[PDB]
Design a protein around this nucleic acid. Sequence first.
RNA 1: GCAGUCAAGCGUUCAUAGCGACAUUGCUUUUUGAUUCUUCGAUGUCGGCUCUUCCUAUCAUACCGAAGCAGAAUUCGGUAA
RNA 2: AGAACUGGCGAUGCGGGAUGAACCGAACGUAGAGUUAAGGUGCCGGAAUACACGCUCAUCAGACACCACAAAAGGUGUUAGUUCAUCUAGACAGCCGGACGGUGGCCAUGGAAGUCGGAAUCCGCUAAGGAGUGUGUAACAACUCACCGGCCGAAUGAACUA
Lengths: 191, 233, 199, 167, 100, 22, 138
Amino acid sequence: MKYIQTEQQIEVPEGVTVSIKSRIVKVVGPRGTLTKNLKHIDVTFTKVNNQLIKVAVHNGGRKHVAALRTVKSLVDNMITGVTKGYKYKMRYVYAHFPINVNIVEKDGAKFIEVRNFLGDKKIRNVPVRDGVTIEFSTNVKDEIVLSGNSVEDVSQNAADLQQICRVRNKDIRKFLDGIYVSHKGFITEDL
Amino acid sequence: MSHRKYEAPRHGHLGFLPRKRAASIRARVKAFPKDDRSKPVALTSFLGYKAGMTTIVRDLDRPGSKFHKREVVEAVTVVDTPPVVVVGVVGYVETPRGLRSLTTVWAEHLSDEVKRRFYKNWYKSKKKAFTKYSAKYAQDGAGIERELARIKKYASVVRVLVHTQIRKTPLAQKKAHLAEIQLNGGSISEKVDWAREHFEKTVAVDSVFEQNEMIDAIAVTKGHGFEGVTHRW
Amino acid sequence: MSVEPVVVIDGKGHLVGRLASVVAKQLLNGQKIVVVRAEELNISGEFFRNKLKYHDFLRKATAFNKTRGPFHFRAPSRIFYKALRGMVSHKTARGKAALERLKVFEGIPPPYDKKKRVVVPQALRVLRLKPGRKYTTLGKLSTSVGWKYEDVVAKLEAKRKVSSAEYYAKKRAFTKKVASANATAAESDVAKQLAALGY
Amino acid sequence: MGAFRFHQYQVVGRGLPTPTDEHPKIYRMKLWATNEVRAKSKFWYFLRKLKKVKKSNGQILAINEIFEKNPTTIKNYGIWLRYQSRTGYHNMYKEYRDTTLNGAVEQMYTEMASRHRVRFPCIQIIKTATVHFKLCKRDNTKQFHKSDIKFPLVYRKVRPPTRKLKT
Amino acid sequence: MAESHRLYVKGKHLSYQRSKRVNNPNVSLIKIEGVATPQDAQFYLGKRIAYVYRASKEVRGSKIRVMWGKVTRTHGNSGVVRATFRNNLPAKTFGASVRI
Amino acid sequence: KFRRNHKHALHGTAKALAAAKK
Amino acid sequence: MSTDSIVKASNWRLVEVGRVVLIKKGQSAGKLAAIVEIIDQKKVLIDGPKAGVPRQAINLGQVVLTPLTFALPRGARTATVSKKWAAAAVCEKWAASSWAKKIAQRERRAALTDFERFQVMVLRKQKRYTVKKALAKA
RNA sequence: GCAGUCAAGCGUUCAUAGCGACAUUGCUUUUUGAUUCUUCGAUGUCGGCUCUUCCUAUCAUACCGAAGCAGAAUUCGGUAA
RNA sequence: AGAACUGGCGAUGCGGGAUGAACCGAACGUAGAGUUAAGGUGCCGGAAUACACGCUCAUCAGACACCACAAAAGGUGUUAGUUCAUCUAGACAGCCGGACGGUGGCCAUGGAAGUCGGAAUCCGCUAAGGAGUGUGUAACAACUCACCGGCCGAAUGAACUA
């Protein structure tokens, strides 16, 4: 029959500053800055001093509680994201054919280009959303590291790389060729 | 399927519906190319008359055939395309309800051309003595220019009032076919200016089109009259 | 506006079906009503289900064979106009005239500087709010249908921009013209006011 | 209160009957009702349910009604209930937070109705049984109210218009 | 809160005058029984007076024509009011009860 | 469990697959 | 670390005591009242200090709280309720002005059929006219 | 005619790659029957031709899932007119 | 299709129900005023954008009867209700963690010995350590689990019903 609801508060770390005006919040740290808009029914996720960020709600129902949990998760991700970063480590796999991967960051619209994917004459490329940065530390041509502050964007970009290479028409077990998420994502750094 | 076993595409398209008489003698282009490149020295369109057809021999290209290389014949339509007078800059603005014209900027000289503007374009062929074009209203380019200043504060994709000077050779007819031609190009302020420079003077085919370039042709078909299903559909 | 000759109505965040009920009834009252800010009206419910209903109506508008009607109306002023025809008795001459008395314009039509007004609790904020299976603006429905819309929002953006400027300077000048009471005043008279009404 | 909700009418009576050394014995059902129209009815339905009688064999001695004895306030009524849905009637013990016996009826009706299936034909119930605030077990609305009397918790709960002010 | 809103409500038609030279248009005189408060008339005026056109009884033309007035101005100022009619009323229905 | 989803995913509705397994 | 944050905010809550409430639609009328005792979220007992403000139990949510609060504590009865209005004061005064309230303000206006009273009304603008003038300066 | 449920059973082993009885609930109105509502001051028959518009329970093409998919021919199935 | 018992239609208007012989209200000389039935009150469309509450978010759905469809199966962790058990003595999700000894137990059979089939079921000491939960080999051959402990803190899951 429920609910009605009450406040939850999480302390903001010294490494993070947050600043909020309206429903849109900026979360700022040394890795960089992150903006999202939290807007929802009868919810506030407010900052009580630059000290605590608190979430409170007049109202509750099943729907609200589920939302509050997402809101509480997102924010924890933003805060950790600005200080720690999030990073995905991804590995190129190719059984026959060389996969030629670069990122055209400096000279063009930010995108990751893969060439000769499965012998494909046509280059397959997808953008990078947000300030997240990709470094491919080639070796033979195994390792990709994708690092950024915004958790959403980082996950999307890493995910985008995985979807581009996907071949739905043939069996996956048979054609290993692609890029796969080798990790999730992640620890902090002394650096 | 109740019938036919044994069912075929329907002869004759619904998009070229209605199969009806054109509104005008002269084709009118509904939309034009986009503002990608140089200014209104680049008129979006030009007009001409169909002379007939000829055939030409050319150095081909399509490497895949064995028949590729040497001279090969290709069909041509010849069209006589005289220098055309861009008389004026008409300003159409985008709003909600539709475009309405702010102005037309006139040159000093259309003289027989305005008589041709009077022909069907007004009506009656030397019928009873005039028809009229009002004269340049004691140097009131200022009226035209202040109205030009108005077009620059927004945006049709800047457009021009044009005519074909038909008298040149093949047509016994003298009368000009007035046209609305869009101007496309670079930034808007320079776009008004170039369009402005162009009206002062005639414009050739050399200014508009380069050779070999891809051109869309719009014209109005041969007229049968009234016809049955078999030839039509 | 609630008189006999005005009549200008604010569409911003109002309920489409609700605006149309009162609008029809006032046209039946014999007013000539100008419904303004057409793109900004909202009709509640998720867009997907709303678009599915309209999509069938578009699919209907694909035929008969013939030409000359039926129709599905692309645009926010047009959607709203369709809404009145259904709301009013479309059979009769009275009903027909009432329909001729509507004009719906998107953004603002040529200057009506005089304020467009909200109707007695017509607005979607309160009228959602438990809540909101989503809520859909007419401008959001019509981007998917096609474009009388594309030019209308383009003008809305320019109208709102121009007007927003005006309103800031207007308000500044008004509080300024106004500081009358920032109290002066008392002057026996204020006692008169308190009494004068009072008794 | 104003325009009822179902004041319980303590209807009493007899039976009252025949030339035999028998006679039926003395009864009560205290039934929740709107006045005498309902009063009669329930008695005949009770007389059908448990007893057996008749109409004529059941004789009504007297009627005494129902306002508020104890506080408006704050039983959270334990109700023994029966709801008719897609066949016959299924047993229920529903303990819900209420103000009072006037309220209890409405809150139960709304619960049979919405939740459980209910429609016209029904009737009602078997008993309503008061309970101590701390005792109250099943559970959602009341758990919060029990806590409120506690208090602190009233300082809680204090929530509903809350998002509205500014202070 | 309000304003008017409320239905109470009886009145009289005093008489409806369908009058020109061809110059003048049509007038209707209404006298509501006590009603509008002096205040309720004055802050307002534009209260719409709707009389239903029903069967009274025997066969009146029982039609789906619901009639709406409006008060133009008072003439009577505490009582009597001017009205005009626009529509079509049923047949010589001066007398008839005013109402929502 | 494992077998149920396999059959459903292959030919059932998505909603039909989930709940019983749960 | 001067000043802090901000937080989009603030604070109205008081379904309990202290919270003045404004009327919905009902009785043969309308008045002002406060929450003595809380039953549950839905049902609350509402009373007021003196006259005919009789205490009613209602399911509240159609019934809206007003911006005002007065200072007391939870658990009340008649004797306590009388003491509180007396101690608090200025609540009636706030009640007159304007915050969903406006009740006296509307009362003043409402009484005004006369000869004399109307003249007074004209006078207030005649006074506005001279202040407008006074603003103009000349 | 087609579908759904259940799943005995078969498929080397394996209910569900595929095949799938008994039983059972449906749906459609395009075969057949049933009827006798409509027309006996008159509805032109089958079939075919040709012209149109449609339907989805999709044979192919597009995108997809599964496989008893190594490739690869393929099988089954989803979305889809 | 063909009976019974009755009302209506036929031969019965008018009001309701989109239309509509037999559905509801209603049995009708005329005319008017009043007030009502049936049934309805966002607009079309009288007349409420009524009041107290609760569920639902599919546009379900605006439907007595009706060419008003929707079932078996009903999932179901949707919501609700019930019935039985477990929880501040600390359940539950997850993660983490521990195991000596009477002694590898009678029957039968090529062969059961924790775990093919088939018995009794006590006890040490004792955080705790079952003659054992599943995964085995011809049979024997490990490892986990039971049972027991922690990190967290508040409810919990199973059955039926609408």
